[PDB]
Design a protein around this ligand. Sequence first.
Ligand SMILES: [Mg+2]
Ligand SMILES: [Mg+2]
Ligand SMILES: [Mg+2]
Ligand SMILES: [Mg+2]
Ligand SMILES: [Mg+2]
Ligand SMILES: [Mg+2]
Ligand SMILES: [Mg+2]
Ligand SMILES: [Mg+2]
Ligand SMILES: [Mg+2]
Ligand SMILES: [Mg+2]
Ligand SMILES: [Mg+2]
Ligand SMILES: [Mg+2]
Ligand SMILES: [Mg+2]
Ligand SMILES: [Mg+2]
Ligand SMILES: [Mg+2]
Ligand SMILES: [Mg+2]
Ligand SMILES: [Mg+2]
Ligand SMILES: [Mg+2]
Ligand SMILES: [Mg+2]
Ligand SMILES: [Mg+2]
Ligand SMILES: [Mg+2]
Ligand SMILES: [Mg+2]
Ligand SMILES: [Mg+2]
Ligand SMILES: [Mg+2]
Ligand SMILES: [Mg+2]
Ligand SMILES: [Mg+2]
Ligand SMILES: [Mg+2]
Ligand SMILES: [Mg+2]
Ligand SMILES: [Mg+2]
Ligand SMILES: [Mg+2]
Lengths: 117, 152
Amino acid sequence: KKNVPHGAAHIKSTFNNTIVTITDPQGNVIAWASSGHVGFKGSRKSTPFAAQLAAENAARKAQDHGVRKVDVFVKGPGSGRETAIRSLQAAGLEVGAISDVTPQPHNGVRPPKRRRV
Amino acid sequence: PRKGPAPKRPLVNDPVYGSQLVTQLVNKVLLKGKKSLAERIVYGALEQARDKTGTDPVITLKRALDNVKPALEVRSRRVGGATYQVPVEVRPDRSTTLALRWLVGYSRQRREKTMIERLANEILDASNGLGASVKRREDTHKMAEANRAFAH
RNA sequence: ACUGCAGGGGAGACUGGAAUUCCUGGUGUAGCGGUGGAAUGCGCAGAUAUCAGGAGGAACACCGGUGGCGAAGGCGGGUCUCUGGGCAGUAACUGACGCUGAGGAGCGAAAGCGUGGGGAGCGAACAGGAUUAGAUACCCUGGUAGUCCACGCCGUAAACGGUGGGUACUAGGUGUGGGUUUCCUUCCUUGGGAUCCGUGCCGUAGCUAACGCAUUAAGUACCCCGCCUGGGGAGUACGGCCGCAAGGCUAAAACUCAAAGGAAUUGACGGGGGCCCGCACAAGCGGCGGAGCAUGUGGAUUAAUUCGAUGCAACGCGAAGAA
Ligand SMILES: [Mg+2]
Ligand SMILES: [Mg+2]
Ligand SMILES: [Mg+2]
Ligand SMILES: [Mg+2]
Ligand SMILES: [Mg+2]
Ligand SMILES: [Mg+2]
Ligand SMILES: [Mg+2]
Ligand SMILES: [Mg+2]
Ligand SMILES: [Mg+2]
Ligand SMILES: [Mg+2]
Ligand SMILES: [Mg+2]
Ligand SMILES: [Mg+2]
Ligand SMILES: [Mg+2]
Ligand SMILES: [Mg+2]
Ligand SMILES: [Mg+2]
Ligand SMILES: [Mg+2]
Ligand SMILES: [Mg+2]
Ligand SMILES: [Mg+2]
Ligand SMILES: [Mg+2]
Ligand SMILES: [Mg+2]
Ligand SMILES: [Mg+2]
Ligand SMILES: [Mg+2]
Ligand SMILES: [Mg+2]
Ligand SMILES: [Mg+2]
Ligand SMILES: [Mg+2]
Ligand SMILES: [Mg+2]
Ligand SMILES: [Mg+2]
Ligand SMILES: [Mg+2]
Ligand SMILES: [Mg+2]
Ligand SMILES: [Mg+2]
């Protein structure tokens, strides 16, 4: 029962999931619908279809709560970034500027050991 | 094969019904070289359908095939530690062949006495869109649509 | 000696940002994480995600390279203090004061040891899940020492250029780094030419079993030190020295075998790379394996069940005719 005409959209697209949360410009989440939140489980949560449908769910929840336009911050080496962007665009929301906010450590924390599979 | 496509053999139009469709159904129901027997069975079924409905048998057949025409198939593939089905589009000719094969197969194992009335009932059910072929098409469509995530 | 030059050479002190994690609060609800697939695991008692603030340790993206420095090992976030070495130029000074170096001494990756501190992340050991016949592993979830600091110890690596140090000589071609030098000196070109110190590649002679080396030699010579006499046993035993320990160093023998090995060639193989093809895969058509009969085979019986054949390529075969 709020009204936030402008807000922010955060998409976290990783190799195992895709989280699409929509916040006000101060960063307070209004909706957070995810690939697991929509019907999906297992490794299918990282599929582009799952990411795009999660974007649809987030966009419709934002429309219900009263959001008309949001900027998009994306991060993670996921493949659902562009599909989520297109769904957010042509699902009744305007994206505006697209920015990448992926963290970049200046040689900080040591990564885990390489996979010997 | 590896060396390109192979052209498909042509068909002739039946003097009784001037359409390749009826010859296609005769070819599909033909077994053991009895083309005359297949023609007799299909003509009896068509005459029965005309007796029960009134409209032209070729028009009823066209309505049936349009109703039972599918859209996608569920051809499977294996990559790593699991195998999953891949829904892909179907060409019109392949869709027609699949629907005709489904209709013939479901008419073959029906609970009636002879294939005249069996095929008449099957084609009428397909025309009204409530028969075994229609059910199989719906099952295939929904089970392929359930695999839309793996669309590579 | 004097004048310049480049440098992640080294030590100490202060300090900066990104990122991860954690803490607190706000927004907020049902998932998050993970894989080839999952599950263990985390959340619903409010998690993942988002914002703001704070705490803490580790490592310093971009520059960054084929580059530079250092005896080797190794060395870059920034600033300051102290300090080492090298190169170039003048020839200013001494006047063979040089080279190597048995023993000896010092330095010396990572792992490990002692004492105190610290611990974000990773991570032996360990635990659970998963794969598999088994999985004391590869994969996932966690997680202790350790990785970090201070002072000591240990002195071992494929510590490799698998090439000891010093000097003299032996065509060239082409990059890069630090200097100097006249000229072409404005042909602006910071290019070309000359010299010194390096660092790569290609290449002449020469050497080599070959691969290859080739002015940074494995070429031509000299001086010094170290090392080998077939492969195992064995760098092990005993003794000795060092070490808190782990262990390090010196270091055999009996016995056993006639090979062990280094290069290159052919072939074959590969769950290596590239291409192509086959009812080989795929779309379908008709069968076997279930039942009865005929034929051949194995086994058993008997007088023989004469005999041969035994994967695909033997099994209605030899046998196109057993009273
Ligand atoms: Mg110190
Ligand atoms: Mg903590
Ligand atoms: Mg919170
Ligand atoms: Mg948070
Ligand atoms: Mg004198
Ligand atoms: Mg000496
Ligand atoms: Mg000595
Ligand atoms: Mg150490
Ligand atoms: Mg310690
Ligand atoms: Mg301690
Ligand atoms: Mg266990
Ligand atoms: Mg692990
Ligand atoms: Mg861990
Ligand atoms: Mg211990
Ligand atoms: Mg020492
Ligand atoms: Mg080394
Ligand atoms: Mg020598
Ligand atoms: Mg020499
Ligand atoms: Mg020399
Ligand atoms: Mg040069
Ligand atoms: Mg060469
Ligand atoms: Mg030699
Ligand atoms: Mg020993
Ligand atoms: Mg001893
Ligand atoms: Mg060979
Ligand atoms: Mg097939
Ligand atoms: Mg059969
Ligand atoms: Mg059978
Ligand atoms: Mg026999
Ligand atoms: Mg035969």
